[PDB]
Amino acid sequence: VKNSIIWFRKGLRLHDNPALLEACKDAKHVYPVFVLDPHFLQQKVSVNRYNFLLESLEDLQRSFQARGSRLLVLRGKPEEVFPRVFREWGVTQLCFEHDTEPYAKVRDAAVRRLAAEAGVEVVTPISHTLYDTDMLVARNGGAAPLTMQSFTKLVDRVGDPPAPAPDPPAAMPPPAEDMPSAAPAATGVPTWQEVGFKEPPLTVFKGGETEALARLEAAFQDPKWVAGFQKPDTDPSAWEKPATTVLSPYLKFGCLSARLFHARLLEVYRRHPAHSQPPVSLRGQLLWREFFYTVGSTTPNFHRMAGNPVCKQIDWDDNPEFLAAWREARTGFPWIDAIMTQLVTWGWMHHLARHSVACFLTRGDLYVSWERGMEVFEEHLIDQDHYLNAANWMWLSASAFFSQYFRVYSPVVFGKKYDPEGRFIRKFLPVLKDMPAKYIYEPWTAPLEVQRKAGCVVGRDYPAPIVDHAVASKACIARMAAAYRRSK
Ligand SMILES: Cc1cc2nc3c(=O)[nH]c(=O)nc-3n(C[C@H](O)[C@H](O)[C@H](O)COP(=O)(O)OP(=O)(O)OC[C@H]3O[C@@H](n4cnc5c(N)ncnc54)[C@H](O)[C@@H]3O)c2cc1C
Numbered sequence: 001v002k003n004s005i006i007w008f009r010k011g012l013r014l015h016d017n018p019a020l021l022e023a024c025k026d027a028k029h030v031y032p033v034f035v036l037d038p039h040f041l042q043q044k045v046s047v048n049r050y051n052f053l054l055e056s057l058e059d060l061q062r063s064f065q066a067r068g069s070r071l072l073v074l075r076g077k078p079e080e081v082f083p084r085v086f087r088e089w090g091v092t093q094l095c096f097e098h099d100t101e102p103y104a105k106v107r108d109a110a111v112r113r114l115a116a117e118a119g120v121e122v123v124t125p126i127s128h129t130l131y132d133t134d135m136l137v138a139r140n141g142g143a144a145p146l147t148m149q150s151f152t153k154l155v156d157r158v159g160d161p162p163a164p165a166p167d168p169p170a171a172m173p174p175p176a177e178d179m180p181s182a183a184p185a186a187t188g189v190p191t192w193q194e195v196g197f198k199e200p201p202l203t204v205f206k207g208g209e210t211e212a213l214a215r216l217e218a219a220f221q222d223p224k225w226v227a228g229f230q231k232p233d234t235d236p237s238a239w240e241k242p243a244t245t246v247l248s249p250y251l252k253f254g255c256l257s258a259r260l261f262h263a264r265l266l267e268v269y270r271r272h273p274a275h276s277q278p279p280v281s282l283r284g285q286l287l288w289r290e291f292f293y294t295v296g297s298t299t300p301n302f303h304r305m306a307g308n309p310v311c312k313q314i315d316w317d318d319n320p321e322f323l324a325a326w327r328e329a330r331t332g333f334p335w336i337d338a339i340m341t342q343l344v345t346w347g348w349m350h351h352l353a354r355h356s357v358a359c360f361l362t363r364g365d366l367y368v369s370w371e372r373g374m375e376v377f378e379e380h381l382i383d384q385d386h387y388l389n390a391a392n393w394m395w396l397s398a399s400a401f402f403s404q405y406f407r408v409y410s411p412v413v414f415g416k417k418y419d420p421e422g423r424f425i426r427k428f429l430p431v432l433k434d435m436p437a438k439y440i441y442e443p444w445t446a447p448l449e450v451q452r453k454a455g456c457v458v459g460r461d462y463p464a465p466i467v468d469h470a471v472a473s474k475a476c477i478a479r480m481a482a483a484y485r486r487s488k
């Protein structure tokens, strides 16, 4: 008989899941498993993203119960849990979605060896990315493209991505009862207070495949907005109704299928001939994700500066004071401090909002390494993706892909062109709520008489700007110009 396990790591969804489909076929029992490490908070992880995963597990649990099944959240390390349940459950097949992250390769290669000794067939279809990334590299001549222009020419030569896999059956083969390691008391979906966190999450985006599909249909309700989407023209200050899809946390965890997203976009494009093209279109946004996955999975030390052959070696400053002020949203620039407050409360910011704080920390003002800023985003971003966070931090620091280090965003003017009244600043920095709009971006320029009436005296309620932007930017550009010469 066939008893199989569908191991969830990414791909927390039932739609477009070829690993689930293979696990249920001709199977008498199916064991849906997520492997949790209860000592994860003991070694980095804000409660905003960890609860987003827990909410995603509760969504899989309810979807499995409605099909006569149950989600099994096992505790411990994978290599120490699977050899036990392989024999206990009589497993003959193990299926999980292929991942290309560094820890994933060394982890899944060990689980494959443990399954081989147990006589367990391993099936690992590709469904997290649009394409087989190793196939794109093979078709390009054995090397990943380093420009988006060439990458777009490659995927259009390859053709369309595979269509989304059909939905699973209405009822699924259930796990065998009275199995000890599958007891409900030891295989439940925990909450955030149970895993060590002591402060509740404040993010407004709830996890789960159902929330992913609900936000998907929300974006596609205006088909002309989807067809004419241009990423650089979106508004970073819009928070009540974000100017972009806000599907990044659901794509990172696999709550939403990228191949379903791409398939729905083509349906619109076929009925809208003047639709936008890459790299500014919505489809182009998915190809940016596919671009960085293709390069990141083929570049050693892609998350570091040293040993990274694609990254430029720049003499960044070791400045804890500048990092601590930038990390704690006390820079003195309301536009920057507000985006860093949205980071720690929501775990998500608009793409150009991340441009402002990444440029300010790296090549624009403080000249701190992008690795330090990536570590901060890794803690708070609910969409933190190993290959996307690193690639865009290297982009913004002009260390890879992007080299126009003369383009420096102003922490004063960049937000003014979208939000002159500064409602984005007043929302996330309520201390500046009563400041007139003339000084909302430069409160230190307000007269003392006005600062006292707003309840916001600079230096007492809101800090003074840590640096003069005109002085700091002129120094960073010169240091980058020296580095870009030293780099030959
Ligand atoms: C410093 C910095 C760090 C970043 N770290 C991450 C990260 O860890 N995880 C992450 O998902 N994105 C990251 N990005 C990219 C980008 O800011 C977000 O992907 C985007 O803002 C998410 O909003 P959205 O889902 O509405 O995107 P949309 O504009 O609606 O795009 C849809 C999808 O396309 C993908 N996408 C969009 N822009 C990019 C991009 N520039 N690079 C790669 N994929 C993209 C995402 O999967 C996103 O869900 C980072 C950007 C910066 C500047």
Ligand SMILES: [Cl-]
Residues within 6 Å of the ligand: 408, 409, 410, 413, 414
């Ligand atoms: Cl600007």
